[PDB]
Amino acid sequence: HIVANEKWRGSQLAQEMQGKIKLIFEDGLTPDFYLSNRCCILYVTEADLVAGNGYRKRLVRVRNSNNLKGIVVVEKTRMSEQYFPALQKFTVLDLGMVLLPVASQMEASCLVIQLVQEQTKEPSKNPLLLLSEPSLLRTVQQIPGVGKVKAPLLLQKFPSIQQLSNASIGELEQVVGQAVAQQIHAFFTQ
Amino acid sequence: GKGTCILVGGHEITSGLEVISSLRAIHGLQVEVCPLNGCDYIVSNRMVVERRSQSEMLNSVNKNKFIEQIQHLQSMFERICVIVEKDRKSYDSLLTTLIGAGIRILFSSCQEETADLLKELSLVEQRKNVGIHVPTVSEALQFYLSIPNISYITALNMCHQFSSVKRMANSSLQEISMYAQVTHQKAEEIYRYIHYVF
């Protein structure tokens, strides 16, 4: 159901996923998991938060790939806590990826499950994935000095904000007159 | 690193005073408190940042309110970032919809660390030439603010960069995109707004 790295055979991660997601174990691949042919997961252990380069070059490789969209998941514990701000500066700010703190790899199980559910389910299934005339009247009402009654009368003679903008004081005199007519032309000019 | 501008919502003076204070006094950047009715920090043209506590995010009764706020922000901003800050489990679904929507998420341990995060977001956006620097003052602002889906900073650099609201109204989609500092499709939307005939 999703492609994993041989590194993960028989592990706690895989044990908790086994039931809800089927796993295909592949050898040598750069990520730890592939969600799709355009998205993947890079897992970072508490262990290799030791100022070592065990994960860094893997993340950079994924960034170089023209289509591949990487999302990094990390074990955040009392010991690795101090090293997290630098990981986050590198991944999210320098590299432009997603970083996900996780306590146990038992927590990462639930996370990867819901991460797959999100990916497999149809587009616009998540809420985050039309001209209004009332707004246009509100916008014209913001030009001094016209209120709720003068606004629609202006739009009647000049059907758009464009036409209202290049409207002569003469033509404005007819519909509103005197100071109000000059007050609209003064707003648009300079 | 310093001099860079940043917009802060008034509600943040009570909510995150140490953040604003650390931004100004430690990292020495030009912070401006503004009336941004629906958001916390404007860190560049195009990017808004939103801070929320780990308790708030775990309390999944403002789960749907939060999502609706992200939707409102999506209309006005090309890039959206949320900082989950530690305070002084079923919500993994919230995080995945955010990620899936291409919304960047940061994690902070304190208000001081959150300020460092905002500083660093500012520099990245400054390096990308989408930096915020502009006067942030002129009262044709309100007219630009009445246009739906227009961020406070968009409206701001519409007042600046356009000689007249008259010439703004007669500008081709190419130059409104560049002078208003907005997207290629966003320039078409406000064009259809100014040019809408009854």
Author numbering:
A (entry chain B): 18 to 146, 153 to 213
B (entry chain A): 1815 to 1902, 1916 to 1964, 1970 to 2030
Relevant lines from the article:
The crystal structure of the FANCM-FAAP24 complex was solved using the multi-wavelength anomalous dispersion method and refined to 2.9 Å resolution. There is one FANCM-FAAP24 complex in the asymmetric unit, which contains residues 1815–2030 of FANCM and residues 18–213 of FAAP24 except that three solvent-exposed loops (residues 1903–1915 and 1965–1969 of FANCM and residues 147–152 of FAAP24) are disordered. However, the relative position and orientation of the two domains are significantly different: the nuclease domain of FANCM is sandwiched between and interacts with the (HhH)2 domain of FANCM and the nuclease domain of FAAP24, whereas the nuclease domain of FAAP24 is far apart from and has no interaction with the (HhH)2 domain of FAAP24. The two nuclease domains and the two (HhH)2 domains form two compact heterodimers, respectively.
It plays a key role in the recruitment of the FA core complex to damaged DNA and the monoubiquitylation of FANCD2 (5,18).
